[PDB]
Write an enzyme that holds these catalytic residues in place. Structure first.
Site, PDB file in Angstrom:
ATOM      1  N   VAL A 115       0.867  -1.170   0.000  1.00 49.15           N
ATOM      2  CA  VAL A 115       0.000   0.000   0.000  1.00 49.15           C
ATOM      3  C   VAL A 115       0.909   1.226   0.000  1.00 49.15           C
ATOM      4  O   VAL A 115       1.689   1.428   0.928  1.00 49.15           O
ATOM      5  CB  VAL A 115      -0.948   0.028   1.235  1.00 49.15           C
ATOM      6  CG1 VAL A 115      -1.742   1.331   1.295  1.00 49.15           C
ATOM      7  CG2 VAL A 115      -1.905  -1.150   1.220  1.00 49.15           C
ATOM      8  N   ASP A 142     -15.562  -8.179   7.648  1.00 45.91           N
ATOM      9  CA  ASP A 142     -14.219  -7.916   8.163  1.00 45.91           C
ATOM     10  C   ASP A 142     -14.140  -6.600   8.939  1.00 45.91           C
ATOM     11  O   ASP A 142     -13.170  -5.856   8.803  1.00 45.91           O
ATOM     12  CB  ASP A 142     -13.209  -7.920   7.005  1.00 45.91           C
ATOM     13  CG  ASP A 142     -11.777  -8.116   7.464  1.00 45.91           C
ATOM     14  OD1 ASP A 142     -11.580  -8.559   8.612  1.00 45.91           O
ATOM     15  OD2 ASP A 142     -10.848  -7.809   6.675  1.00 45.91           O
TER      16      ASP A 142
HETATM   17  C1  LIG Z   1       2.493   4.628   8.074  1.00 46.66           C
HETATM   18  C2  LIG Z   1       1.146   4.158   8.645  1.00 46.66           C
HETATM   19  N1  LIG Z   1       0.155   5.252   8.735  1.00 46.66           N
HETATM   20  C3  LIG Z   1       0.277   6.238   9.820  1.00 46.66           C
HETATM   21  C4  LIG Z   1       1.259   7.343   9.429  1.00 46.66           C
HETATM   22  O1  LIG Z   1       1.691   7.987  10.626  1.00 46.66           O
HETATM   23  C5  LIG Z   1      -0.906   5.332   7.812  1.00 46.66           C
HETATM   24  C6  LIG Z   1      -1.362   4.165   7.204  1.00 46.66           C
HETATM   25  C7  LIG Z   1      -2.400   4.214   6.288  1.00 46.66           C
HETATM   26  C8  LIG Z   1      -3.023   5.424   5.961  1.00 46.66           C
HETATM   27  N2  LIG Z   1      -4.083   5.481   5.026  1.00 46.66           N
HETATM   28  C9  LIG Z   1      -4.606   4.389   4.319  1.00 46.66           C
HETATM   29  N3  LIG Z   1      -4.097   3.165   4.388  1.00 46.66           N
HETATM   30  C10 LIG Z   1      -4.613   2.127   3.722  1.00 46.66           C
HETATM   31  C11 LIG Z   1      -5.701   2.262   2.905  1.00 46.66           C
HETATM   32  C12 LIG Z   1      -6.267   1.063   2.221  1.00 46.66           C
HETATM   33  C13 LIG Z   1      -5.425   0.075   1.652  1.00 46.66           C
HETATM   34  C14 LIG Z   1      -5.961  -1.057   1.042  1.00 46.66           C
HETATM   35  C15 LIG Z   1      -7.343  -1.224   0.986  1.00 46.66           C
HETATM   36  C16 LIG Z   1      -8.186  -0.259   1.549  1.00 46.66           C
HETATM   37  O2  LIG Z   1      -9.538  -0.413   1.465  1.00 46.66           O
HETATM   38  C17 LIG Z   1      -7.661   0.879   2.165  1.00 46.66           C
HETATM   39  N4  LIG Z   1      -6.260   3.525   2.775  1.00 46.66           N
HETATM   40  C18 LIG Z   1      -7.305   4.010   2.062  1.00 46.66           C
HETATM   41  C19 LIG Z   1      -7.382   5.330   2.326  1.00 46.66           C
HETATM   42  N5  LIG Z   1      -6.431   5.663   3.196  1.00 46.66           N
HETATM   43  C20 LIG Z   1      -5.729   4.590   3.479  1.00 46.66           C
HETATM   44  C21 LIG Z   1      -2.565   6.601   6.575  1.00 46.66           C
HETATM   45  C22 LIG Z   1      -1.521   6.556   7.495  1.00 46.66           C
END
Ligand SMILES: CCN(CCO)c1ccc(Nc2ncc(-c3cccc(O)c3)n3ccnc23)cc1
EC number: 2.7.10.2
Length: 267
Positions: A22, A126
């Site tokens: 991702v 889920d």
């Molecule tokens: C680094 C981790 N961190 C925190 C940063 O301090 C972090 C991690 C993720 C996100 N944002 C997102 N991560 C995964 C998906 C996703 C992926 C696949 C399928 C699905 O339906 C959704 N996603 C969709 C929209 N926004 C996100 C924002 C910050």
């Protein structure tokens, strides 16, 4: 639904990591530029993605993550609106200051997204704190529809590794997933959120959880969780699918209590 690979920019940074990766990026739109999260793959792994995209395609709600579209290039890519603050469980793990009213606000927003998904006759299958993402500290959106199914017009359940600690009895015993079984998962989500992102049924294997529930035993009240919210949790945890509330009755309970909590702060 189909996107222009050249209009897509991907950052070397990987947001998360199964299917592949991702990544964060931006899609050059009509006039503005859109921050996005992109699910990227490494035959059947490709078919799940398409199905997943097709579900999000049909969903239009403030409390559900929006898909921008898909892309075939180096790999298959699912491009979605970015939720900046990421998964609800991890946010709360790293932010233990978050106030009681703010959690009740976020769980109510998830009840609204779930009431819609119910109206629309989709099962999530889920629904976990890990699969709730934050736009802001006060704006939550349901994600991860890789296990989601549109119900047939004639049935109100879908007949099927499994997130067992999130599953209702009927799912485990009869492989039957309905909106009521998402309500069960919501209960566990409520618990995770008031436990500030701790894993449910700590150190118990799926087999043991199954046995505990059958005995009529439920998880206890998380510290500082309002009695009223724990009652709702247990209610979600009604063993018999038939007597378990739907997300309509659930959302209204939350809506009401949240406004009673909003009335109290002002006083
Ligand atoms: C680094 C981790 N961190 C925190 C940063 O301090 C972090 C991690 C993720 C996100 N944002 C997102 N991560 C995964 C998906 C996703 C992926 C696949 C399928 C699905 O339906 C959704 N996603 C969709 C929209 N926004 C996100 C924002 C910050």
């Amino acid at each position: 639904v189909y996107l222009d690979r050249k209009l897509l920019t991907l950052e070397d940074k990987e947001l998360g990591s199964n299917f592949g990766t991702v990544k964060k990026g931006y899609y050059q739109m009509k006039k503005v530029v859109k921050t996005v999260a992109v699910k990227i793959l490494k035959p059947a792994l490709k078919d799940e993605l398409l199905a997943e995209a097709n579900v999000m395609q049909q969903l239009d709600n403030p409390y559900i993550v929006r898909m921008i579209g898909i892309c075939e290039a180096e790999s298959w890519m699912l491009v979605m609106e970015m939720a900046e603050l990421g998964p609800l469980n991890k946010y709360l793990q790293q932010n233990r200051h978050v106030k009681d009213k703010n959690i009740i606000e976020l769980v109510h927003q998830v009840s609204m997204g779930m009431k819609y998904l119910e109206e629309s006759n989709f099962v999530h299958r889920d629904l976990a704190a890990r699969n709730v993402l934050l736009v802001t500290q006060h704006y939550a959106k349901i994600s991860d529809f890789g296990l989601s199914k549109a119900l047939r017009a004639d049935e109100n359940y879908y007949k099927a590794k499994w997130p067992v600690k999130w599953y209702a009895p009927e799912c485990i015993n009869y492989y039957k997933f309905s909106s009521k079984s998402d309500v069960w998962s919501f209960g566990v989500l409520m618990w995770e959120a008031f436990s500030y992102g701790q894993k449910p049924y700590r150190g118990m294997k799926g087999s043991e959880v199954t046995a505990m529930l059958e005995k009529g035993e439920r998880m206890g009240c998380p510290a500082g969780c309002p009695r009223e919210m724990y009652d709702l949790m247990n209610l979600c945890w009604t063993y018999d699918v038939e007597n378990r509330p739907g997300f309509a009755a659930v959302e209204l309970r939350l809506r009401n209590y949240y406004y009673d909590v909003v009335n109290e702060g002002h006083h």
